Amino acid sequence: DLPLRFPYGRPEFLGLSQDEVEASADHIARPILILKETRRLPWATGYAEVINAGKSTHNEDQASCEVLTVKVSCHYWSLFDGHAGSGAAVVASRLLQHHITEQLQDIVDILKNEKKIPHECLVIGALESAFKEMDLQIERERSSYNISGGCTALIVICLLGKLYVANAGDSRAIIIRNGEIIPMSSEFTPETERQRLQYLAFMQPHLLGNEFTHLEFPRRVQRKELGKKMLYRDFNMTGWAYKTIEDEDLKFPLIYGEGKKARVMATIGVTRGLGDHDLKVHDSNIYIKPFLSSAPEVRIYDLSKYDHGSDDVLILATDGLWDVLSNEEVAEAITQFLPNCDPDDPHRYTLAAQDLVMRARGVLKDRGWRISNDRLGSGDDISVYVIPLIHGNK
């Protein structure tokens, strides 16, 4: 009905032209696109991506990477895993950096120059406000532009010799530094956020629409067990204890499923990010957005405290990577791939990124996408940054 805020596409730094773009969206070939060696990114950052194995017509991942000027320079990398549409992810790929820039400008003069407030806390609050302000802008432009769906957001900035990794979703950032894995992010899923979700449904039961219960049970409760004792978990418990099933325990659980496929209100499997303002429950007028948050967790890495080698890297990747490769596998692939490349070859990290995507996507024969050890490959969109920390050395 309404116009697109921006045309759909792939990251601008891939310099694709719209016929290249549609050769990319091949669900059976799944071509791995990489940054052309002729186009260098900040810090010679490597990038690689690939479309899902069928579940959405378009690659709903997006990514932006550039050097911001704050009136000081600020390096920037972003990944947005869109869902239920490409809209939010494209909008955030273009506009979040503007919000980050505006928030940093409020505080840039404190940075170059009664609760005591460290300067990092100002930078963190600028990122925190920037995510909040990117939402809101999506919220208010919903009714004028077709900004479909929702997206997670994972961004990194390098400001004054520190990395700030700010995550609101289930993408993941890790540093691989001389083989050790430094996690720079945590995921926001119905699993990791259960207590927050439960407590909010408890404090505001009208958000459940008399269709869900905020209590969590080992398996689905059917009227079969009404009046029997059963294990339950409330927002205040990490553990389990017994309760007599008392009618309302019959409703669909607010949190259901195990692990990576736990879902809030039978609908969404990630609890933070942007968009999803009008997202409702399957065939229902219950809104999901009260339960989601745009608020990112922000972690800091001081680049000045370590002399990083050619192989010490920050990996940014959407769940498409991490859904099949552990942190340890990614570290093993990185540390085994990069020593085979000339350390002064600017393409190194793109090829490392291509290696990671390859190892998560796999090869399609007749048994579906398989990676190493005959494991199912990832059928999701996969986007990978490989950021060489050697260019952040003081």
Add this chain to the structure above:
Amino acid sequence: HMSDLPLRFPYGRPEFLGLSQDEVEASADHIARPILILKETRRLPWATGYAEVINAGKSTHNEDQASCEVLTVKVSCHYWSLFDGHAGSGAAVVASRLLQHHITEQLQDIVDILKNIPHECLVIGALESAFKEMDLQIERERSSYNISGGCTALIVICLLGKLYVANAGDSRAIIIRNGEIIPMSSEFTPETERQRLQYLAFMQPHLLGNEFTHLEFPRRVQRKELGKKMLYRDFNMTGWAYKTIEDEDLKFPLIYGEGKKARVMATIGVTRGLGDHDLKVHDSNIYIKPFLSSAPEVRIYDLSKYDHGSDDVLILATDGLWDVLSNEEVAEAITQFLPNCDPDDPHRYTLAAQDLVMRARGVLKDRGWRISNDRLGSGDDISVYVIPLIHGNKL
């Protein structure tokens, strides 16, 4: 009112001290501040050490309470507990007598699973429910008995070779194992709980009674700054950003202060525990209890992954100790003291407990109580358990 009701229990010191009430009287001296230790004639489970000392004058009674016994689930469950009472001794006395019965009963619900979802998660759950049920019982009995004030609750059980440390308050548990400090709990303060507190006030603004705002500011906002930009911090923020000050920012902050002066609606400086069901904001009608919680955090230490020594101890203490002694000073004091008593001396850990209390309490000057390096001594009630992990070893 509660003042018209009889006491649920008479005031006393921990039962296991076997103090006659002449001895109890002798112990509530605020000038000599006598350090009470466990009589060698009364052994505690695991030869557990215990020492305590009354506050320097800020309340007529020692408002700490402590309970130590071997419970039986119908299996054996060792139980140590500290309650830092406030605004009265009633909650802490009641909790020191009745929380164990809630624990026993919640454990009975899962005892058959234990000796025949991970099992730890069931023990954890029982503790979390027991705390909720010890509150609630206080909440109902409130109407028939004078269960004054509130208290924090730090408890430890040993069940089937694991220690569960359930903390709701600002007492602290640490293991000192071969000189290293293994933290077994986190305090629940207006600072550590800021975002929970702010978000609850955001969700339920009626809890502020139009006297408070949920936003935090680097200092108290003055009316003079209406319309100007100021750093603020909201519930979803760890950092600070700018905002224009808008009338509602002039209300008194929900969280204001730093360290132990940090307070919630200018009334309470600890945010978890039992009791306080009728606690109200300083001169007013705003109830504090909606922001309080009885839910402990539970941490597990597996007593089989390590063959513990004579000097490997779990230290439980109320903030009377941790307010003037850091974890490392406590570790310094344990590792310096315990090597100097016969390993087979059953009074070993009570003496270490006493030494900890004494190192926190200090000596009396014309200026007040001072510890080492002319530092100010603790003026609070101090209660310390030294629990020797050697008694938790395999087999």
